[PDB]
Structure 1
């Protein structure tokens, strides 16, 4: 239950119960020699053992860290040990905050603006420090097909991290049969955790709001012609990747009139009234993915 995460970083699977016996790990120095070798942990000069191997016990997050072997003053190799704690058949998820929206146990939320193969995932955390996130993705699992992700960076503030990914061989117009997999590694100090997300791009589609929303009053009437355009981030040609719209007219108050219209056109005629705003949002025409945020403009 011990595997390499990256060069010189090893995850120890830790099954825990209050009277934990502790798992024994044997660490081997990465060297052609066996003489003059001592071991230290992290930034300490304290010798924890001699020779090419070190035998340690792991029970808690402090039992881990970067064990190092030395010969003649020189570092021979570093081995960083992280612990993945399995409470009782289930692995821990302290680092990421459940978003609780799509389903429960939803730590990663992904959305796409179009069918290009680019998407964004984000996640939330309480933690402000000692935090590293590593992101991997692919289409399919049997023979994974490439998806390239960037670095996970703090995006806003609760702490929000986002990552941008791009499918290498996108087929925007296809009917997807294998889902995209997203795998995020979460490291807080010496605590290692796994997060996973599976989906079709078609299902995480959320277009940007309608653009250039504008009003045009009728001569000596209350009626206004609402007009707008497709967002620039949306897939082209529009003749193929159609959108549909929801036009809303609403007051500031509670009991005031409301008006809500559905249309595949990029125009509508509504009745305006003082202190009402006209909102317009968008959704893929043929598939019931997510509505854009509202674009809106006051009846003024």
Structure 2
């Protein structure tokens, strides 16, 4: 057993059919010692007595809020969370894994340090999330995450849909030109009723880069059918643009798209264009399209 927060405890449990439950002692935080009574928010009536209650916790009915009582007045109360372990494996039932069997998908528009992570949920009901820096050493990269939000978009995998969640985070210390020598190691804590699970990931910001679409994609004709198309870097992108250079791909929407490093080209013809980091093969941006007219 281990403490998640004040008077909230997590109990690791083996979920095999004939598993021996964990015996856990829960003492009351009070000076009195007589007439002490215990109750549960799952079971009806008195389920124990004495300042310290000793119980065998295997099923979820053994979880919930345990309250002390003496002489009709309430005292302290402790909460028990369950962490399932089946076949030696920690349960992964709150989250729905992506096609690649991973759970967390993060993406960043620039090297500033800001990024967002998102996840899927199997059933959006009675959920509680909490994200933080896994490693807490001095030579670790400190991260300050925001609050998790339910997304309007519903992902469709197999032939089934799933609600998506998302959270924004910012990296504490940065020196933009420098190379990242160790990754950002994250850990997601998930609660659902009295079930506890947690998911971890490590990554470098460079691998999660996804620029924003190019702005002001304008047109100007020249001669019969030939036309020059121009645009400009997005406002979100890192500066200076001489350092965070970009390579753009140009396709024609009625793969086979051709790369152009300048911010304009002439071609005969929808005209769609996406962006990518010039020097690193990171994720490309969303397409910015305009009619070939």
Aligned to 1:170: 174
Q: Structure 1 unaligned runs (5+)?
A: 252-257
Deviation, structure 1 residue 268: 1.3
Compute the TM-score of the two structures, normalised by the length of structure 1: 0.89
CA distance in 2, matches of 1:46, 1:38: 10
User: How well do the aligned residues superpose, as a CA RMSD in angstroms?
Assistant: 1.9
137 and 126 in structure 1: CA distance in 2 versus 1, 3 angstrom threshold = same
43 and 73 in structure 1: CA distance in 2 versus 1, 3 angstrom threshold = farther
Q: For 1:155-234, what aligned pairs fall within 5 Å after superposition?
A: 155-156=151-152, 157=154, 158-219=162-223, 221-234=224-237
CA distance in 1, matches of 2:202, 2:164: 20
Secondary structure of the residue that 2:46 maps to in structure 1? coil
Q: Do the aligned residues in 2 keep the contact of 1:13 with 1:84 (CA within 8 Å)?
A: yes
53 and 237 in structure 1: CA distance in 2 versus 1, 3 angstrom threshold = same
Aligned to 1:254: none
In the alignment, structure 1 residue 290 sits paired with structure 2 residue 288 = no
Q: For 1:48-197, what aligned pairs fall within 5 Å after superposition?
A: 48-101=47-100, 104=101, 106-137=102-133, 143-156=139-152, 157=154, 158-197=162-201
Q: Do the aligned residues in 2 keep the contact of 1:138 with 1:146 (CA within 8 Å)?
A: no
Aligned to 1:266: 263
CA distance in 2, matches of 1:243, 1:71: 70
CA distance in 2, matches of 1:74, 1:43: 20
CA distance in 2, matches of 1:259, 1:224: 19
CA distance in 2, matches of 1:110, 1:140: 21
148 and 74 in structure 1: CA distance in 2 versus 1, 3 angstrom threshold = farther
Q: Do the aligned residues in 1 keep the contact of 2:210 with 2:282 (CA within 8 Å)?
A: yes
Compute the TM-score of the two structures, normalised by the length of structure 2: 0.91
The count of residues paired between Structure 1 and Structure 2 equals: 285
Q: Do the aligned residues in 1 keep the contact of 2:42 with 2:61 (CA within 8 Å)?
A: no
73 and 211 in structure 1: CA distance in 2 versus 1, 3 angstrom threshold = farther
CA distance in 2, matches of 1:89, 1:201: 33
Secondary structure of the residue that 1:203 maps to in structure 2? helix
Deviation, structure 1 residue 187: 0.8
